[PDB]
């Protein structure tokens, strides 16, 4: 059976802080399912009045919102934080043993790569 | 001007953990705006590669998504965590001094009350 | 040394975790007499710095004995007015099976199995009142 | 005692915070010569356990002096090849105004004001590769 | 509202601290029946997030009732084989007096007072063995 | 060369909190030498005004006070905390690389054992 | 009565870390008495096997070792850390309520001052 | 890839630690020009989240060049009025040897070696005044 709710909240809060390291495997979790899990375990101090309430139990991990229908395929244009959160292997494995993964879905496992990216930074223009 | 991004991330992470106490004032912040602020300050270790990138700068605090159009009025059926997050006074005041509140909007200030609520809890049925 | 049972550190550790198992509707849990359980706790050094008497022969708890919870007479029947923690503790199936495996169930007794149900309750909590 | 300027604790504290002000496009920031600034740091006990020489008369930094950053000759003009931290530090308008208010600007000099712009850069970071 | 007794937050808080009072030889401590005490705990919201039933009239524990600890018949006499935590809890003089002040002692009973003594025990601990 | 004083203070404060585990090796350090090291690294907030002062530099680790003169032999009747403090292997090794061990002395290495011991505990005398 | 031993150890460990501030009052505690209190509350992980043992109970706070005999007067040449430790007011008050002060002694209360002091620091001699 | 030098992570890490080496009377330390050092810092990604330009060919710092610290003319001689951090940084023997090993020393220069001495200083600190 599932770990107590205090342990769930605490284990996952810690695991959410894991650093990206090249080659590690992380798992996508639908933002909506994760926020439901948060209400249930009382993750936020300003929304813990329903901790343990079966009326907010999140049920099996459900990444439907991330998937186009039909072979399992990710929708396009998904955005980090907005649509999904990421958990390292230990965090994903814990959630799966506690809640199960919804029947007919497979884990959405992805790798940490080093990526070049163009960004805009403010600078004092001393010369020009 | 605004505090450095490390201070922003850290001050707000702390303030997000403030306990509810009856009679205190808390402020609604649109979930979407707050997640944009998170990318910008590198709040999550798995999504901090755009910390300081002006392409993800959140702009003035924008609670439009929480408001019906027309006098400022909150949409109905809004849900804690899903649609908005809550910050105590110190957290709201910091975000407003750092980003401003979008022109034509007013703060959405609410009070902590003690509320009776019906919940479902699992119990071992020893008798019956 | 424990006669084939898990070593005392493992017993303490497995049961400590199993006590905390989240309740789920339809699961079967088991009552364990609190006096038997307190003796087991001393025997394994449960939640203690000194672990006084851990492993002592005279605190070995023996076969699980729930007779203090049961009414006298032919059919096995739970006493009324029993109170959680004071009279019994609750373990999930896995915790019950481990204790039975390590200690046996006393002869002439059957396990005291109960189901998890969902109970409606009215509680009072602080909440930011968004809608007046 | 500081001749009307803020006390040394307040100077150190206000400037420490102001140094860290987030850059915003279109804001005006000011160059301060690093040797002048190092002397001010000693004078106010900046970032130091011992605060050796804090308040000593011979480390009073005097009027803000940026002449080490400026080309000789008539019109005021910034030397080439100046390097942040080594040759100058950067303060926002409020930090510049506070220093001017406390120390004055040396006679015959004008402030060295520069604008914040947005600079495109290519950086390398770890990222979970969602789309192959 | 509590009829002159301390408010429920204060009762919970004072007693929580008093339960933990260090034992000192010659001090007098008092037994409190665990079922009475469990009811008091519910009534005051002791050690609970939900504090379900806190302040409910039907969990008001009433006058301190230790009759479950006492042998029947004329003179007041403690049952044998009572076990700490399961059958009773222990409070120091101050904790006992507070409960009596808030709830009264049930009529026909006297307090169950016991002395602290020093008990020799043999324990096992890790220690750096300095002298072989 | 030796680590900076902040690192010394912090590494050793942490290592001083290591749990005893049977079979581990710990090292005796003369209380007097260790208190001198404390003044030098500013270990205590109420006595750090001489941190880094060469006038309180402790010099090479000196366990003389623990040793009878003559082969290296420990004095009798030495008491934990009073006469010496104990450091685990990592802590001892750090102090030796930073300060050296005084010439003509050897480390005083001892093992963690499980030991039966008679103690007096207060109890409420319920029966008798 | 006295707080439990875990609370004593923890309250005092925290209070020992209080910063000196000019004008605050601190109290001298004889090193020997304090080390005895440490054994009793199990302050150090490597010497906690006698926590709660009445055979190491420290008894009333005893600063005799700090005092010349005869009016209460401090011995000369006492050294911080070596002969005594210092506690802020809250720490002293806690120890006194838990243990009492030995009869015929008065508290040894002293003030934090700002003091000029000559020290020797290592420096790279760049010029000369 | 670094031509036989340690990889960039190791260079950054070894030097970061070596910069902090406690000073000891009689030890030899070495001056490194701050502009050379700043370029090395960019090259190795020193103390930076983005590590912008780490490993870029155009920020490779080249042979250690202290000529900005040295007076012109025949014999090698340190300029006056040089200031720690602004004009140079200090490394112990091991840190100097590592940089020389990785980058070489520019041709026509000798190392700038200086000794650690003990300097008497008067500092001001809070202290509990035990003797009036």
Can you give the three-state secondary structure of chain A, one letter per residue?
A: CCCCHHHHHHHHHHHCCCCCCCCCEEEEEEHHHHHHHHHHHCCCHHHCCCCCCHHHCCCCECCHHHEECCCCEECCCCCECCCEEEEEHHHHHHHHHHHCECCCCCCCEEEEEEEEEEEEEEEECCCC
Residue A43: φ, ψ to 5°: -60, -45
Pairing of strands F109-124, F84-88: unpaired
Best to test chain A binding among C22, C24, C26, C125 (most A CBs inside 10 Å) = C22
In chain A, where the domains are located: 4-112
H or E segment and range at residue G99: helix G89-99
* Both tokens assigned to G72: 């209460």
String of DSSP letters for G9-73: HHHHHHHTTPPP-TT-EEEEEEHHHHHHHHHHHT-SGGG-TTTT-GGG---SB--GGGEE----E
Query: What Å distances lie between residue G89 and A86, B28, E84, G35, G79, CA to CA?
Result: 49, 43, 38, 19, 20
The CA-to-CA distance between both ends of chain G, in Å, stands at 66
- Alpha carbons A6 and C20: distance in angstroms, whole number: 10
* Both tokens assigned to C19: 């006590």
Buried b (16+ CB within 10 A) or exposed e, G83-97: bbbbbbeebbebbee
- Alpha carbons G1 and E29: distance in angstroms, whole number: 11
The answer to whether G28 and G108 have CB atoms below 8 angstroms apart is yes
- In sequence order, what are the residues at sequence separation of 6 or more whose Cβ sits closer than 8 angstroms to the Cβ of residue E29? E23, E90, E91, E92, E93, E96, E113, E114, E115, E116, F124
The CA-to-CA distance between both ends of chain H, in Å, stands at 67
- Alpha carbons B107 and B86: distance in angstroms, whole number: 12
- Alpha carbons B118 and B100: distance in angstroms, whole number: 39
H or E segment and range at residue F112: strand F109-124
Residue C25: φ, ψ to 5°: -50, 130
Pick the CATH number of H7-116 from 3.40.50.720, 3.30.310.10, 3.30.2230.10, 3.40.1050.10: 3.30.2230.10
- Alpha carbons H90 and H97: distance in angstroms, whole number: 13
Burial of D108 (0-12, 13-18, 19+ CB in 10 A): exposed
* Nearest CB partner across the interface for D119, out of A21, A112, A123: A123
Crossing angle (nearest 10°) for helices H34-44 and H8-19? 130
Contact assignment for B35 to A82 by CB distance below 8 Å: yes
- Alpha carbons H66 and H99: distance in angstroms, whole number: 13
* Nearest CB partner across the interface for C22, out of A5, A46, A49: A5
The answer to whether F91 and F27 have CB atoms below 8 angstroms apart is yes
Burial of B112 (0-12, 13-18, 19+ CB in 10 A): buried
- Alpha carbons G48 and G41: distance in angstroms, whole number: 7
- In sequence order, what are the residues at sequence separation of 6 or more whose Cβ sits closer than 8 angstroms to the Cβ of residue C98? C6, C11, C14, C15, C18
Secondary structure in 3-state letters for D48-75 = CCCCCCCCCHHHCCCCECCHHHECCCCC
- Alpha carbons E35 and H66: distance in angstroms, whole number: 83
- Alpha carbons H78 and H67: distance in angstroms, whole number: 9
Burial of F107 (0-12, 13-18, 19+ CB in 10 A): middle
Contact assignment for F47 to G82 by CB distance below 8 Å: no
H helices present in chain H, as ranges: 8-19, 34-44, 93-103
Q: For B64, which DSSP code? A: G
- Alpha carbons H37 and H91: distance in angstroms, whole number: 11
Strand partners, C91: C30
String of DSSP letters for E13-79: HHHHHHHTPPP-TT-EEEEEEHHHHHHHHHHHTTT-SS-TTTT-GGG---SB--GGGB-SSSS--BP
- Alpha carbons E105 and E63: distance in angstroms, whole number: 5
- In sequence order, what are the residues at sequence separation of 6 or more whose Cβ sits closer than 8 angstroms to the Cβ of residue A69? none
Contact assignment for F38 to G82 by CB distance below 8 Å: no
- Alpha carbons E64 and A14: distance in angstroms, whole number: 45
Which chain A residues touch D if contact means CB-CB below 8 Å? 20-22, 26, 28, 74, 76, 78, 80, 86, 110-127
Contact assignment for E126 to F26 by CB distance below 8 Å: no
* Cα G11–Cα G13–Cα G15 angle in degrees, nearest 5: 65
Burial of H99 (0-12, 13-18, 19+ CB in 10 A): buried
Nearest CA to A124 among E124, D90, E96? D90
Q: Chain D residue with minimal CA distance to A85?
A: D128
- Alpha carbons D44 and D79: distance in angstroms, whole number: 28
Dihedral sign for Cα C61, C66, C69, C72, please: negative
- Alpha carbons E25 and E42: distance in angstroms, whole number: 32
Contact assignment for E35 to C86 by CB distance below 8 Å: yes
- Alpha carbons H58 and B119: distance in angstroms, whole number: 65
The answer to whether D55 and D8 have CB atoms below 8 angstroms apart is yes
Give this entry's resolution in angstroms: 2.2
- In sequence order, what are the residues at sequence separation of 6 or more whose Cβ sits closer than 8 angstroms to the Cβ of residue A35? B81, B82
* Both tokens assigned to A74: 């990710």
Query: What Å distances lie between residue H42 and A69, B4, D3, D117, CA to CA?
Result: 48, 22, 42, 22
Residue in this structure with the two tokens 């396990």, named with its chain if needed: C111
Contact assignment for A124 to D114 by CB distance below 8 Å: yes
* Cα D5–Cα D10–Cα D12 angle in degrees, nearest 5: 100
* Rounded CA Rg of chain A: 18
Burial of G8 (0-12, 13-18, 19+ CB in 10 A): buried
* Range A4-112: architecture per CATH: 2-Layer Sandwich (3.30)
* Rounded CA Rg of chain F: 18
Chain D residues close to A126, C-beta within 8 Å: 31, 78, 82, 84, 114
* Cα A127–Cα B2–Cα B4 angle in degrees, nearest 5: 75
- Alpha carbons G29 and G31: distance in angstroms, whole number: 6
In this complex, the chains that touch H, judged by 3 or more CB pairs closer than 8 A, are: D, F, G
- Where are any strands of DSSP class E within chain H? 28-33, 88-92, 113-129
Q: For C67, which DSSP code? A: G
CB atoms within 10 A of CB C75: 6
CB atoms within 10 A of CB E116: 20
Best to test chain C binding among E88, E124, E125 (most C CBs inside 10 Å) = E124
H or E segment and range at residue D43: helix D34-44
* Nearest CB partner across the interface for H118, out of F1, F3, F54: F54
Residue D21: φ, ψ to 5°: -50, 130
* Nearest CB partner across the interface for C129, out of B113, B118, B127: B113
């Amino acid at each position: 059976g599932a770990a107590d709710l205090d342990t769930q909240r605490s284990d996952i809060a810690t695991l959410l802080k894991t650093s990206l390291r090249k080659g590690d495997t992380w798992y996508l979790v639908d933002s909506r399912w994760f926020k439901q899990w948060k209400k249930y375990v009382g993750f936020d101090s300003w929304d813990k009045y329903q901790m343990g309430d079966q009326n907010v139990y999140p049920g099996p991990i459900d990444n439907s919102g991330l998937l186009k229908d039909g072979a399992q395929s990710l929708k396009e244009h998904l955005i980090d934080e907005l649509d999904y959160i990421l958990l390292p292997t230990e965090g994903w494995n814990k959630l799966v043993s506690w809640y199960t993964l919804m029947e007919g879905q497979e884990p959405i496992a992805r790798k940490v790569v080093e990526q070049g990216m163009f960004v805009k930074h403010c600078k004092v223009e001393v010369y020009l």
